[PDB]
Amino acid sequence: FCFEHPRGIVLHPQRGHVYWADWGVHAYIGRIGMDGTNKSVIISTKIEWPNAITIDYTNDLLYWADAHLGY
Amino acid sequence: EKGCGINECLDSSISRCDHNCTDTITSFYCSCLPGYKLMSDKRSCVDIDECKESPQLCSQKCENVVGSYICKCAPGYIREPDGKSCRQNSNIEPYLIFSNRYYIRNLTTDGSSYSLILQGLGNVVALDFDRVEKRLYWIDA
Amino acid sequence: PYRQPIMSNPCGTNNGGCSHLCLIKAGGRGFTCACPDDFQTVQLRDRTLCMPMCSSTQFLCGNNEKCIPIW
Ligand SMILES: *[C@@H]1O[C@H](CO)[C@@H](O[C@@H]2O[C@H](CO)[C@@H](O[C@@H]3O[C@H](CO[C@H]4O[C@H](CO)[C@@H](O)[C@H](O)[C@@H]4O)[C@@H](O)[C@H](O[C@H]4O[C@H](CO)[C@@H](O)[C@H](O)[C@@H]4O)[C@@H]3O)[C@H](O)[C@H]2NC(C)=O)[C@H](O)[C@H]1NC(C)=O
Ligand SMILES: *[C@@H]1O[C@H](CO)[C@@H](O[C@@H]2O[C@H](CO)[C@@H](O[C@@H]3O[C@H](CO)[C@@H](O)[C@H](O)[C@@H]3O)[C@H](O)[C@H]2NC(C)=O)[C@H](O)[C@H]1NC(C)=O
Ligand SMILES: *[C@@H]1O[C@H](CO)[C@@H](O[C@@H]2O[C@H](CO)[C@@H](O[C@@H]3O[C@H](CO)[C@@H](O)[C@H](O)[C@@H]3O)[C@H](O)[C@H]2NC(C)=O)[C@H](O)[C@H]1NC(C)=O
Ligand SMILES: [Ca+2]
Ligand SMILES: [Ca+2]
Ligand SMILES: [Ca+2]
């Protein structure tokens, strides 16, 4: 999973993470520290076009929408 | 043909039904109280972490208890008398801000009001706001 | 204002003592000093030196605050 088509970004400054999505061939939702450490992959399955991403802050849930699978 | 069946839980700890038991013509089957699930051994029960297993029960935040669960609200929100639905306590009413290509638009949460924040732009494809300085940022692609 | 919840700034009122950038550490608790693109991080004993490092097609500003293209 690599930066091919980055789109959508949300910060979570309480835990110092940045979440972003990519709708490349190997689509995923990534995570990195706000200072550029702890790169990881959060979602990688059943995802094709993650245009949309956010965090609710009150419940601490990640939310996203897929344009292709339409969920 | 067990001769003819009877409850097998009646004898002391046979099959070790952890919570509750019931029988049938030729077999038993244990059961667990609500908030407890049986695991693979088909004899014992464990607590449900409803805050992870079923997040939608609580509107806003959840705390797990052995058995049931309790819903709580983040600071700034109050729980309405239904016991699960948190309501925002600030007397500031939220409104949506979204971008069309040429315009940043202002829309109410219920959709009642609809106005332009700004117009004549190139192609605003993203925006975000800062509450500290009451400032708005956007990318004109 | 609920959608940007109040939190303490790790870089509070001192830029975290960093020369250029103070970024929140992964996990939110700490902070990390960083340098811009055309700068070299010569990490010292108790501080990070952001030594300017800009191409021959770039011009270095007077205070070494940034460097810009030669044109
Ligand atoms: C739209 O909304 C924005 C955001 O709310 C308004 O911007 C603010 O305007 C007020 C003035 O009404 C500013 O208040 C002043 O702040 C000064 C200090 O901060 C400024 O200067 C530093 C300098 O380094 C900057 O870093 C910083 O960003 C600010 O620009 C104070 O020194 C001022 O004090 C003086 O006036 C007050 C009375 O107002 C007296 O009591 C003092 O004695 C003194 O004379 C003043 O408080 C505020 O800083 C602005 N915010 C920002 C982010 O700059 C816009 O004005 C508003 N526009 C309209 C037209 O509605
Ligand atoms: C399935 O089996 C369980 C395990 O025995 C049953 O739980 C028990 O239910 C009884 C009847 O409701 C409870 O008795 C009551 O206890 C209170 C004191 O807390 C007392 O004041 C009442 O007079 C009454 O005796 C008992 O406490 C409870 N056991 C435990 C530990 O929770 C359950 O009822 C069974 N369910 C079915 C549908 O068979
Ligand atoms: C840096 O990134 C890593 C990788 O994404 C983060 O690791 C993950 O952290 C969570 C929270 O602690 C772990 O979940 C927990 O795992 C334990 C079992 O180990 C379980 O008992 C808990 O219920 C919970 O599920 C997760 O497993 C872990 N993943 C890995 C591969 O280690 C880490 O938290 C990040 N650290 C910081 C400070 O940024
Ligand atoms: Ca694909
Ligand atoms: Ca579709
Ligand atoms: Ca529980």
Distance of CA B36 to the CA centre of its chain: 18
A14, A33, A57: residue with CB nearest C26: A33
| Secondary structure class of B79 (helix, strand, coil) | strand
Say how many C-beta atoms besides its own lie within 10 A of residue B62's C-beta. 21
Element (H, E) at B50: helix B50-53
| Secondary structure class of A4 (helix, strand, coil) | coil
User: Which ligand is nearest to the Cα of residue B21, counting in written order?
Assistant: 2
Residue A22's nearest CA partner among A40, A12, A35, A9 is A9
B64 CA → ligand 6 middle, Å: 4
| Secondary structure class of B57 (helix, strand, coil) | helix
Say how many C-beta atoms besides its own lie within 10 A of residue A10's C-beta. 19
Dist. CA A65–CA B69, nearest whole Å: 29
C-alpha torsion sign, points C1, C7, C10, C13: positive
**Distances, alpha carbon B131 to alpha carbons B109, B135, C1, C4, in Å:** 18, 7, 6, 7
User: Between chains, do A14 and C7 touch, taking CB under 8 Å as contact?
Assistant: yes
- Using DSSP bridges, classify how beta strands B104-108 and B114-118 pair: parallel, antiparallel or unpaired: antiparallel
DSSP state, B3? S
| Secondary structure class of B63 (helix, strand, coil) | strand
Both tokens of A42, joined, read 């959060």
Phi, psi of C35 (to 5 degrees): -120, 150
Both tokens of B78, joined, read 């109050």
- Going by C-beta distance under 8 Å and a sequence separation of 6 or more, which residues neighbour residue B68? B34, B35, B50
Method of elucidation: cryo-EM
CA angle C36, C37, C43 (to 5 degrees): 60
- Going by C-beta distance under 8 Å and a sequence separation of 6 or more, which residues neighbour residue B114? B105, B106, B107, B108
Measured distance between the N- and C-terminal CA atoms of chain C, rounded to whole angstroms: 43
Measured distance between the N- and C-terminal CA atoms of chain A, rounded to whole angstroms: 21
Q: Give the DSSP per-residue string, B111-135.
A: S--EEEEE-S-S-EEEEEEETTTTE
Residue B75's nearest CA partner among B92, B57, B60, B65 is B60
User: Between chains, do C23 and A17 touch, taking CB under 8 Å as contact?
Assistant: no
Beta carbon of A37 within 6 Å of any ligand 3 atom: no
Residue B20's nearest CA partner among B11, B29, B12 is B29
Residue C20's nearest CA partner among C32, C31, C36 is C36
C21: β partners: C34
* CA-based nearest residue in chain C for residue A33: C26
B25: exposed, middle or buried (Cβ count in 10 Å: 0-12, 13-18, 19+): exposed
User: Which resolution, in Å, applies to this structure?
Assistant: 4.2
| Secondary structure class of C17 (helix, strand, coil) | helix
How does B121-139 read in b/e, with b if 16+ C-beta sit within 10 Å?
A: eeebeebeeeeeeeeeebe
Dist. CA C21–CA B44, nearest whole Å: 56
Is C19 in contact with C50 (CB distance < 8 Å)? Answer: yes
Pocket around ligand 1: residues whose beta carbon is below 6 Å from it? B 133-134
Q: Is C13 left (phi over 0), alpha (psi -120 to 50) or beta?
A: left
Is A22 in contact with A41 (CB distance < 8 Å)? Answer: no
* Most distant pair of Cα atoms in chain B: their distance: 88
Dist. CA B122–CA B129, nearest whole Å: 19
Dist. CA C6–CA C44, nearest whole Å: 34
- Going by C-beta distance under 8 Å and a sequence separation of 6 or more, which residues neighbour residue C2? A57, A58, B76, B77, B88, B90, B94
Is B121 in contact with B140 (CB distance < 8 Å)? Answer: yes
- Going by C-beta distance under 8 Å and a sequence separation of 6 or more, which residues neighbour residue C53? C38, C39, C40
